[PDB]
Design a binder for this molecule. Structure first.
Ligand code: HEM
Ligand code: HEM
Ligand SMILES: Cc1cc(N)nc(C[C@H]2CNC[C@H]2NCCNCCc2cccc(F)c2)c1
Ligand SMILES: Cc1cc(N)nc(C[C@H]2CNC[C@H]2NCCNCCc2cccc(F)c2)c1
Ligand SMILES: C[C@H](O)[C@H](O)[C@H]1CNc2nc(N)[nH]c(=O)c2N1
Ligand SMILES: C[C@H](O)[C@H](O)[C@H]1CNc2nc(N)[nH]c(=O)c2N1
Ligand SMILES: [Zn+2]
Lengths: 407, 411
């Protein structure tokens, strides 16, 4: 029932009671741990709705009140009638903030309550989506003073009238397969980039081409739109010490904005719910730039640094990795674009965990994702035991739309 | 039931069936994952089934399943259990068992080497002096003047739980730690408690930063006894840096032989409470964990100062910069002194090959991602990108309570 988590650096021990309220399954069993696997009706809806409303009314200290019982009856009647129901604005904002709060893979949750929620449930077309999204982009960017935001499009109905953003993130760089056999730009987006060209996009065919938005309203064919360049804040990447760094031709965008996930609140499913915060430096510097299957710039940078690249044991990869990540953080800070380093972000997360344990009885956290992809053990989260479990409201994965869509 | 694991860098997909053989529990449930939790007498009743399952495994491995030799062995063990409440492993079974415990060790990234283990049978040992002699021989053999060889020494099994053989040291070779009145620590802070016990037992401590601890050895449930490992047997490496001449002036050194001595080895239901085993180091164990953990030697600030890094803000990544330099130094020093060491790039690449092999020949490879991924530069190693499945197979190495917490003092 009660579970302890220990921090092996500080000896601080926390007691988790919040897991007892978990409703979805983890993928693990008593016999096998799947902790490192990336992807591990009318009748159905009323318990889900009831569970959520009870959470909500409890949160505002009105559990079992007249408003509470009356809301539960109103929702019951609407489900009995229409097969679905509608969230109040207050419930929608609560549900969104809590889906972020419950995101066990998110290191930046100390910020969970500050989310700006844009209600786009009145949207009907792809042009309308484009408009909402441009507005979200400009608001969240805030000329470099980034603010966290989510834009919420209409909920799933029969599932043949889905709102979807086909992009994985709102702002990403194109990837093209070449005659040469190699890849120009971002290789993760090769497939998406070719679907855009298939739909009519005139590709500039460069290394950092901001992809068009491809938007699907109400189950219809998706439509292409170019985001106004003045709305896409980009940072040229230079190094505080290495003059040649600027010459590598590197840049990245300021706004990380996940657009392919599903928001689940009280059994209602929001299949188009792009949300954005700001970067931790390592996402760009370690993952985007240095993954083998991404921009893979490690070979080139070590070359400019004149490191000994003959044997892995000179740690040439590791040395270059650090310089690159210094060059991401310096550039963003010099341009006054919000960014956090992995040391600061993980320190905040430990503080957040402590807050959540004392105020809420726990914090679901996925160690495999929380610990940064560089310098793991010099960050405090490495030494922190974490319990992973699934609470709702939640953000969930969903299949890529190009496999699902019926034209 | 067939489970798939994908490598997200290479798209290679593997299929696990071996998990079906797993008996024991992980600590996770359908509703909670405890994958990051560090630590999530036996009767005749329970013993024969454990023995049978082990001997079935063993006889399958040698292609003699269902043979007369197989059947006679099951009979002889069954008879021995009913007669004596326990049984004795044959030498061949003990070797197979110890190698498989290593093969099954899901937290170990060095398992490509599993079949080359040298097994020393010390089941005829009766005294702590006898333990000391066996351990010296293990250390000399494993050390091999810098050309390290994997080894394990196996002392007599648990009987009634009152006559346990134990090595009180967590590793055969480690450095003392001393808490000073001002609250600072001299030497290795991980070993403060153990060092205090040693001193209480009568060890005369030189009270320096790298004092090799004495062995504290318990035979047959008796009170443990102190022994000094002969210093000529303890290979040590002074740490210097290929480019930074001042690095040597930090006065750092480390020992060559990593030798875990506080784990329990389980084979066919038998429990070997003293089974010290050794391999050789991956650099990050020393350079990242031993030197840079805040609760260990904690040398980051001092190195960063000597490097004249900007230490006023974390986002200069001064900690990360110093970290890499320290780890270059550890690898360079070991290689220069011709002492076996593996870097985290090479060890992780070898682990992926081993894992692919194991899935194909064995139907799986239990692996604990949290432990396998190195503590620096995670995602530039191929293991970061490899999905893994963690489950518990026997034979196995298990943790056991520290002996000072459980021992009954005879005085
Ligand atoms: C404000 C600053 C934020 C920071 C620094 C931050 C940081 C991160 C990081 C480092 C990850 C790991 C993702 C990866 O490695 O690809 C992550 C994942 C995640 N974040 Fe946060 N985040 C922030 C804001 C948000 C917001 C506003 C939301 C939702 C409203 C959110 C929801 C999530 C979710 C659902 C994941 C898991 C995504 C997945 O499984 O791929 N984050 N975040
Ligand atoms: C041959 C070279 C070897 C290498 C490079 C190696 C590497 C490692 C590493 C890096 C770890 C994680 C240790 C930590 O972070 O504390 C580990 C753990 C482990 N290794 Fe290996 N190892 C080797 C040999 C062996 C041998 C010979 C055995 C026993 C026969 C063994 C059994 C284990 C076990 C049981 C663990 C888990 C320890 C724990 O949970 O505390 N290893 N090894
Ligand atoms: C909101 C927010 C803020 C922030 N700093 N960072 C983020 C993650 C974004 C940006 N940088 C990486 C990207 N990550 C989001 C997408 N992750 C998918 C990983 C994946 C792939 C395939 C199968 C799976 F099961 C899972 C979001
Ligand atoms: C045999 C071998 C080879 C090798 N390269 N490396 C090793 C690990 C040794 C050496 N370098 C670290 C040390 N690690 C072994 C002891 N670690 C126990 C951690 C622990 C703490 C508390 C609760 C737990 F459940 C677990 C062994
Ligand atoms: C196989 C493994 O689960 C996968 O590589 C994970 C590991 N940890 C991660 N951690 C974060 N933050 N982001 C990721 O994409 C991943 N990938
Ligand atoms: C809390 C967490 O599980 C703990 O710090 C683990 C993380 N991974 C590790 N990995 C290895 N190899 N060794 C360790 O001691 C640890 N510590
Ligand atoms: Zn698990």
């Amino acid at each position: 029932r009660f579970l302890k988590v220990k921090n092996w650096e500080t000896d601080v021990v926390l007691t988790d009671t919040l897991h007892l309220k978990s409703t979805l399954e983890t993928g693990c069993t008593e016999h096998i741990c799947m902790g490192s696997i990336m992807l591990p009706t009318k009748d159905q809806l009323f318990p889900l709705a009831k569970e959520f409303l009870d959470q909500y009314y409890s949160s505002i200290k009105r559990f079992g009140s007249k408003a509470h019982m009356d809301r539960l009856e109103e929702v019951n009647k609407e489900i009995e009638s229409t097969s679905t129901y509608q969230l109040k604005d207050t419930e929608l904002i609560y549900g969104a903030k809590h889906a972020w709060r419950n995101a066990s893979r998110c290191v930046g949750r100390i910020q969970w309550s500050k989310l700006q929620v844009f209600d786009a449930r009145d949207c009907t077309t792809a042009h309308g989506m484009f408009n909402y999204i441009c507005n979200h982009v400009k608001y969240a960017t805030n000329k470099g003073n980034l603010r966290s935001a989510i834009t919420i499009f209409p909920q799933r109905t029969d599932g043949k009238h889905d709102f979807r953003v086909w992009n994985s993130q709102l702002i990403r760089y194109a990837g093209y397969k070449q005659p040469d056999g190699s890849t120009l730009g971002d290789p993760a987006n090769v497939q998406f980039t070719e679907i855009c060209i298939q739909q009519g996009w005139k590709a500039p065919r460069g290394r950092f081409d901001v992809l068009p938005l491809l938007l699907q309203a109400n189950g219809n064919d998706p439509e292409l739109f170019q985001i106004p360049p003045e709305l896409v804040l980009e940072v040229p990447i230079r190094h505080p010490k290495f003059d040649w760094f600027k010459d590598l031709g590197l840049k990245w965008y300021g706004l990380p904005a996940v657009s392919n996930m599903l928001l689940e609140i009280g059994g209602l499913e929001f299949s188009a719910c792009p949300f954005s915060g700001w970067y931790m430096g390592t996402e760009i510097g370690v993952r985007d730039y240095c993954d083998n299957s991404r921009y893979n710039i490690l070979e080139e940078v070590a070359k400019k640094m004149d490191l000994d690249m003959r044997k892995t044991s000179s740690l040439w990869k590791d040395q270059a990795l650090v310089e690159i990540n210094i060059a991401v953080l310096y550039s963003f800070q010099s341009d006054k674009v919000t960014i956090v380093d992995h040391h600061s972000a993980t320190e905040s997360f430990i503080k957040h965990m402590e807050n959540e344990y004392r105020c809420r009885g726990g914090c679901p956290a996925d160690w495999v994702w929380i610990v940064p992809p560089m310098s793991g053990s010099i960050t405090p989260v490495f030494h922190q035991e974490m319990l992973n479990y699934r609470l709702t409201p939640s953000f969930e994965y969903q299949p890529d739309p190009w496999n699902t869509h019926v034209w």
